[PDB]
Amino acid sequence: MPRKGSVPKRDVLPDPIHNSKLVTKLINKIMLDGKRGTAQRILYSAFDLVEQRSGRDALEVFEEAINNIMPVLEVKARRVGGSNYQVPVEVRPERRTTLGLRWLVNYARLRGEKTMEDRLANEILDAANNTGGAVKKREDTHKMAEANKAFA
Amino acid sequence: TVVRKNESLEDALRRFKRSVSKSGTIQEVRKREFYEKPSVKRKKKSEAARKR
RNA sequence: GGAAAACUUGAGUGCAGAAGAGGAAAGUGGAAUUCCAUGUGUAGCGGUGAAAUGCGCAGAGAUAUGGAGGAACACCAGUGGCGAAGGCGACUUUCUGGUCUGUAACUGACGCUGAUGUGCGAAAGCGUGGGGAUCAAACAGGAUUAGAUACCCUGGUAGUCCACGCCGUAAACGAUGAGUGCUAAGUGUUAGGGGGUUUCCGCCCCUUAGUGCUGCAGCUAACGCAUUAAGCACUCCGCCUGGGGAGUACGACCGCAAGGUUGAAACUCAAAGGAAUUGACGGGGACCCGCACAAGCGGUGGAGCAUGUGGUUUAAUUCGAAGC
RNA sequence: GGUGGUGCAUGGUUGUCGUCAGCUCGUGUCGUGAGAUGUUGGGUUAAGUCCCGCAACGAGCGCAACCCUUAAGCUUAGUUG
Numbered sequence: 001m002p003r004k005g006s007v008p009k010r011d012v013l014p015d016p017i018h019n020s021k022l023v024t025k026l027i028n029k030i031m032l033d034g035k036r037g038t039a040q041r042i043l044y045s046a047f048d049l050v051e052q053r054s055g056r057d058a059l060e061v062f063e064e065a066i067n068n069i070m071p072v073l074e075v076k077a078r079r080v081g082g083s084n085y086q087v088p089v090e091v092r093p094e095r096r097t098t099l100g101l102r103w104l105v106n107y108a109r110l111r112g113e114k115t116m117e118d119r120l121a122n123e124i125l126d127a128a129n130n131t132g133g134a135v136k137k138r139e140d141t142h143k144m145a146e147a148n149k150a151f152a
Numbered sequence: 153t154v155v156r157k158n159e160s161l162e163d164a165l166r167r168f169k170r171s172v173s174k175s176g177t178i179q180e181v182r183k184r185e186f187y188e189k190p191s192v193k194r195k196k197k198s199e200a201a202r203k204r
Numbered sequence: 205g206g207a208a209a210a211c212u213u214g215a216g217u218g219c220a221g222a223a224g225a226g227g228a229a230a231g232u233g234g235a236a237u238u239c240c241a242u243g244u245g246u247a248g249c250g251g252u253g254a255a256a257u258g259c260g261c262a263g264a265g266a267u268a269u270g271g272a273g274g275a276a277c278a279c280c281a282g283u284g285g286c287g288a289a290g291g292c293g294a295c296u297u298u299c300u301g302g303u304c305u306g307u308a309a310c311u312g313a314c315g316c317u318g319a320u321g322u323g324c325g326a327a328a329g330c331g332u333g334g335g336g337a338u339c340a341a342a343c344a345g346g347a348u349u350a351g352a353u354a355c356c357c358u359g360g361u362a363g364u365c366c367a368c369g370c371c372g373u374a375a376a377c378g379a380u381g382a383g384u385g386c387u388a389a390g391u392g393u394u395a396g397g398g399g400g401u402u403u404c405c406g407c408c409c410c411u412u413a414g415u416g417c418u419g420c421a422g423c424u425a426a427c428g429c430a431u432u433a434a435g436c437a438c439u440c441c442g443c444c445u446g447g448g449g450a451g452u453a454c455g456a457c458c459g460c461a462a463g464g465u466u467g468a469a470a471c472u473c474a475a476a477g478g479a480a481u482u483g484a485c486g487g488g489g490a491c492c493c494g495c496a497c498a499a500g501c502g503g504u505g506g507a508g509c510a511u512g513u514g515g516u517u518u519a520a521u522u523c524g525a526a527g528c
Numbered sequence: 529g530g531u532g533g534u535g536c537a538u539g540g541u542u543g544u545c546g547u548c549a550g551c552u553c554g555u556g557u558c559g560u561g562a563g564a565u566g567u568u569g570g571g572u573u574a575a576g577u578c579c580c581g582c583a584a585c586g587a588g589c590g591c592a593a594c595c596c597u598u599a600a601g602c603u604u605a606g607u608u609g
Contacts, residue, residue, distance in 0.1 A: 001495090002496095002497075003494065003497085004492095007499095033502085082254085177278095180279090187339085197281080198283075201283090
């Protein structure tokens with residue numbers, strides 16, 4: 001029911017492993033087909049190469065990795081007819097936390113391996129330092145409405 | 153014809169756009185774009201002014 | 205009806221002033237599109253809903269103290285004013301028209317319609333000289349678009365602008381002919397006369413002529429009108445009485461033409477028409493609702509099957525479905 | 529005997545618009561009539577679901593649960609459970 005405009009946002013649960021709502025919201029994103037026991041336990045094996053390439057703990061590195069995915073300018077195409085409609089949108093932190101995690105489990109499946117025992121381990125610690133993989137959520141909107149700043 | 157100094161350019165842009173606003177200069181070259189007939193120039197002189 | 209008088213409202217001749225785009229003639233200056241030249245410079249400038257034709261290497265435009273042309277002259281600009289109407293607009297002046305108020309001096313109704321006649325007569329068209337600076341029929345170019353040269357665009361011809369001849373036509377309509385009496389109001393505003401306070405030129409109010417906006421009784425079919433009557437009365441002229449055919453044949457008049465004015469019938473249809481009502485759809489606007497769209501997650505179409513449709517096929521591949 | 533024909537002779541009868549929420553009557557009044565008011569203006573909402581204010585009042589149909597049940601209770605019999 002979107003034609004009323006704003007719908008209330010859906011809420012999160014913090015897992016007792018980390019006491020973080022986003023750790024289980026990282027669990028709620030990796031659940032392809034909603035597989036709870038079959039993907040979370042294998043994502044628990046798929047931070048073992050994430051923490052192999054990064055000695056810092058997960059609760060610090062997961063707010064480090066998405067901090068290079070949270071943008072300041074995204075694009076919402078407005079009805080302007082024959083224009084590029086590239087309107088800069090400073091994100092509300094609800095969707096800014098949401099959009100930083102949306103492109104993560106979209107991208108693990110086009111690398112050299114195709115096993116989610118380590119597809120989620122391949123994907124995360126390539127996408128922490130604002131270079132490649134999931135930063136094209138953030139860094140490509142920083143090269144989309146900027147060379148054409150005439151179509152805000 | 154209005155010089156804006158002793159400030160920044162923002163209120164100088166907001167003077168130039170205001171000196172444009174309080175003038176029959178940009179409105180006159182808006183007035184003098186094309187021709188309206190004197191059977192219809194009084195339609196502008198009544199529907200904007202005889203109702204005012 | 206004629207005969208002898210007067211009064212002045214009504215009208216004219218008086219007097220004191222207001223205003224202006226009212227017609228025909230002389231000046232002052234501004235700004236602009238076009239040109240030629242300086243400086244300047246070199247890649248684009250113009251034009252485009254979308255790009256392009258074009259204009260660009262000559263400097264195209266640009267750019268200013270300053271060089272010019274065509275033609276008009278925002279500001280004072282208004283349900284302002286004047287003109288019978290077509291109309292009237294930078295002004296300074298010339299010649300005036302005419303409006304209006306006030307005092308009302310005077311002549312003693314000197315009036316209205318208005319057939320004839322005479323004028324004006326908007327725009328375009330028949331032509332002349334400034335005209336082609338801008339605009340622009342006709343013509344041109346580029347593409348769009350499913351369709352072009354159409355909606356887009358310019359260049360550009362007479363025609364434009366004005367003066368010099370007209371034609372005699374417009375929704376020239378306030379869709380209300382012109383002159384006179386009488387019946388609810390409020391409300392601004394244009395000019396003159398009237399003032400009370402005063403004002404430091406302004407408040408309130410009488411009146412005239414009007415310019416406007418709302419609004420009784422009366423009115424009509426209703427709209428709507430109601431002191432700037434389609435109300436209540438009088439006088440004159442003109443026009444009308446079904447629609448086409450028809451402003452049409454012919455004839456008459458005019459015109460330089462364009463063509464115009466004047467102005468029927470045969471024959472056919474019994475409906476045309478004016479108001480006001482309910483739906484209808486809307487490429488007219490507005491308002492809400494929907495995994496309708498977006499926000500996210502897969503599938504079918506990707507390819508093997510088997511399932512019955514539609515094609516074939518038979519004497520059967522029964523018979524009916526068939527967009528949600 | 530007909531499935532031989534004919535939904536279009538038809539009784540039906542369903543799906544659709546469609547969750548669409550809209551749809552009707554008596555007394556007033558007003559109109560020469562053609563016809564209009566009760567469902568609306570203000571604020572509050574999931575749908576004739578509100579209250580104020582409205583020339584309205586009365587009468588409605590669908591209208592929410594009412595029917596079945598989730599679950600959260602109590603009570604009964606401990607029955608082969």
